[model samples]
Target chain A: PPAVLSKSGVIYGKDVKDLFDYAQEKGFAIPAINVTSSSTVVAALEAARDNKAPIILQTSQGGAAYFAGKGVDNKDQAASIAGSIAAAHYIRAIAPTYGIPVVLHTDHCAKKLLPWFDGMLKADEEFFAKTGTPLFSSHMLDLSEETDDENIATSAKYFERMAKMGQWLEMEIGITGGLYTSPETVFAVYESLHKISPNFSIAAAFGNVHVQLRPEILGDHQVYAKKQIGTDAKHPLYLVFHGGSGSTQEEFNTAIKNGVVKVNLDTDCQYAYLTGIRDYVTNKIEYLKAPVGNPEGDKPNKKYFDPRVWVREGEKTMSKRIAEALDIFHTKGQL
Target chain B: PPAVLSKSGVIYGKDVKDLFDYAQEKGFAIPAINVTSSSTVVAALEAARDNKAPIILQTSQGGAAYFAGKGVDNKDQAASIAGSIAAAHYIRAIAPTYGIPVVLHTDHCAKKLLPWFDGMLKADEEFFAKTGTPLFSSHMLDLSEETDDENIATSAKYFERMAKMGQWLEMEIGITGGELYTSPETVFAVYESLHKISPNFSIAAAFGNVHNVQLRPEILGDHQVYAKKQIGTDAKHPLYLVFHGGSGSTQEEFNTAIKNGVVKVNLDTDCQYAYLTGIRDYVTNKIEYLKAPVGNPEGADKPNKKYFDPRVWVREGEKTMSKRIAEALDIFHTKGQL
Candidate 1:
């Protein structure tokens, strides 16, 4: 019902008292947790709720498309299929019953997904009204790193259209080091977006890789980038750390205290779901004839055989990470 | 194993027999069908076989990205992941089994997809050897109609580069109707590529309409541009025609017999898939819940949903169109080859 961002590009958490308090300055370090299933979604929300934190439950193009982009254009589906909208609906449906506060934000809506973009925008405010948060990772985030001079022109074209709308805009200045950029480059990007779109409630680069995250952002650069946010903020810009994989508590703690609002944690959940089944299959791996009882799309090893079991396990890890992040960011009892 | 494109240009089925007959001679319309999914892939191939027709098994960026690009890289893998390679593999793999002589040509591999112009040169013969097709559709294949100059420059650059790679090219020229152009203005494009490239496998152009088969053959005019091409073309060079709108055809064919290869069936295979999927969701999915949910990433609500399957189900729609097209262009009798 209230707000999280300011013109100084700072995000405030509700119910907390100090700078390090997670719930109070959830407006800061707004965690953007990437998800693939309901379990992770529940885990992310529970982590946020138990710790009194605010989060952005998002998915990538592949995940969104996998679940929904197949042919149906849900309003908030990621290029992933506007799943952002559906995720938002589930989040908001619970808020009134639980008396919690949250917002739904889409992650990485690229060009070819333009059709999905139009669908999300059409359901914009209404979608928000139901979820308690209304925002899209829109068409004009940022792609300057690769386009040479075209970045400025392309962004200018996108910004002009949005600036007039005065929409709560979040811009990405560089390609995140999701296994893509170097650590210095990721930090430089963090510093640059602060200089570029200071009005953004959330901004991201590389350190925040995904569980469902891409192949980039593996380890050292991951820790190095995670621990250095807020080094230069007057009104600390809330951080959105991705790449929750190959990460440690010490590094995540360093990340939370410095500045990390939303931590996108999907790839981790995906691997978590697969790990249990993988270990199960390791004991019984075989190339048997297709079992009559076996369902299609599931492998012969029976990994992820029951979507619920692995999905629930994934939910557990995601929840733990979210909860751990809430505790690290110190978001306890703030709500 | 060897190719036969001269300054006069070689016409595949026109010069000799039924193999590669989609590369027909002038005065005959060449039919093409696109396959985006496994079913559509099977459909197009089966349809060609059913009609004993020489058909193109072309797939575009939209198809490549949608059917396969999911989770693929944004640069090139992003599109091909949607199944350009998979589709090609499907067609080439199945063709020999069906004895269907299909062309596993890429719909359009833009310059942007190549990363760098020089990188494309490295792929020079490798892509041809693997797919049994040439770099037919370049930047011109899908450029905005407003991009006449850009298309010209881009194609000319590729044209020169293409010359060194192989004989014959499907130099796509002109703007599409609606999104780009809608007149015979693009006819000048065919003239330019046909003249500049000199030798072509087939010169495909945007004949104002977005889909080719949609136009009656009378409507599929050269605007007299072929006359200009004929003058420049040596006696041996066959003035081939490539048309856009894979199965999006509005054409029925009248005097389309003037050119050796006129794309008969127009189709945007992936576009159709997207359209059908979008419509079906409207009919069955929970829109109210979508409108009323709180915060979650896109598709987080329906985690179990499949990626674009409803659209893939339209395999029959695309195949039906291919059949309709073969029926429409029955005269050239290029179905079973010579």
Candidate 2:
């Protein structure tokens, strides 16, 4: 709707919503990538720029701790909080140089991990006070383990605070392991969430699991939202697909058409990174065994074993996979 | 000297000179480590914090290019320049959190690599315009392969520009190998030419210090030879000396050099070995778990995400490298000197 929606850089609040809305209209789903280090973050950003697509960069609770280094104490989720803040600072500084819009998000905060969530929210509030924008564009609260009443109520409470900073809230409606949400429940969520703000998206369980996808249930929810909201719009609900890494292109196309504005991709990229490093080590095993000697002679192996050499190999493969994912999501050339 | 000289954080300009001056007076040589990535940079910083010592984090021309990723087109040394700038920004943002004074440096710019040096200077001038501090604390000019006149002449020209920003220059007077050991006259010649521009400079005077091994601690005493001639009996060590190829040297050797005004020691090869050794052992021990994502020795359906995560292995490298750096700090009498 606005020219800023198509511009390249880190987008937050209303800009994030506008971009998501634009993606739903354009028949594409922005790939939300989980990153662990600056290498992975750079790989995803580079791929997005090359493909001419906007991207969502996210960190899981565990991934955040790893970004801070594993040695840091995680008592009261301090490490995760600090690490996520560091990543946000890093992305903010480097994203504009890549010339692509990035939605900074954090993934999957369960009920037990509310302290981590609260810590991040505090950071967002503090950042908002100074910069007039939250540190993250959105955050996912995976409280599907709770009863429907608790899930909706807890999400509503958090969304109210998030709305003050114009931050988007991604709430889970049902557990992703074979528990399917009916049309009635979908409408109920829409009815309650839409009142507070239009910046919320629902990850309704369509029997979705990691590395798997179910597009038909997504269509069902979109159909239900159209009927309940009394709108002539073809897709009335903003949906997100989790566990989408292993899905085929056809499934992704179907999900995007059904109002899936964002798709989470982690498992595939994770394996791609490992494959790159494993293949590199396997091919250069002789050179990597020691620093000074190899099969040829006492020549130094510093060139081959330098962490930059191998770590970059991983970044390369991961970037390739992310570019492929962007292509499949029809997200290329959307900038 | 300013109290900021002893403070923790990324120091620049006059503060860098003060810290080096302090190191000279206190009988310790700050380790100037060559780092290739964020992991290596963090390892060095963590080690410095743990040891309560000031540190110098430097990137070589090749290593700077690697930091930008090998895929980047380095035409006109663009990748090296971009990588070095990115590293400086990263260290600046994270260094304060580490709470240790750090000297951001770049290593080894030969005559052919002057483009890279020029690029970094431009970035420094641009950064200095806004921040009132240069992007880096110091940079090394390794023109030892050139004739004495050319080396000193080129170094003087560059040092003149660098002095405007209060940036320190480390000029190599003699080659690192046994050939053409730096004479006391050579050291004085460097001082006479460069000190006119600014006193914020150092010399990598060759003392048979090979990069990876061998010890020539006694040769460092030659500094007294020049200090007496240059400033008479009043100055014990007037020149700020840099020790290249510092790896594998004993604590006694480091002490000997420190006693003779060696304020900076370059470390690369040993840290490379230490970093690689950690990753090698981790991969070897966990080879089965790292082979695939969904299968390991435990079962077919098992997930190996925990084992194969890059963070796990990268942290292993960081740990070993940090430990090695801490040892180096202790050997140089740098521990608990914050």
Candidate 1 CAPRI-style tier: incorrect
Q: What lDDT would candidate 2 get against the real structure?
A: 0.80
Cα-based RMSD of candidate 1: 20.5
Q: Write the per-residue lDDT of candidate 2 for residues A206-295, one digit (tens) a residue.
A: 767643456888898888788877889988888999883456778888888999999886777777776676676564455453433345
Q: What's the TM-score of candidate 2 when only chain A is evaluated?
A: 0.94
Task: Please give, for residues B1-338, the per-residue lDDT of candidate 2 as tens digits.
Answer: 45654676688888888888788888888888888776787788889888888899998998787656565668788768877877777667566756788999999899989999999999899989887899899999999888888899999999998888899999987743221467777778888899889999998877878644246666566766666666775767778888888646777777888998898887676788678667766657444544343433555456676677677777888899999899888888778787
* Model 1 bad stretches (over 4 Å): A1-335, B1-28, B75-78, B81-83, B108-124, B127-140, B143-150, B175-198, B211-238, B246-261, B269-338
Worst 10 residues of 1 chain A by lDDT: A6-15
Candidate 1: tens digits of C-alpha lDDT, residues B1-338: 21321111112222222232333443454455544444344445455555655555565565544333222244634334324443443344334433444544556555455442233333434565665443322222444443566665666676665555443445555544432333445555545554565454455554454433344333334444444454664432234455555333333332353343454434453323332332223223222222222133454444322222222223334444445545644644555442
TM-score of chain B of 2: 0.92
TM per candidate: 0.37, 0.86
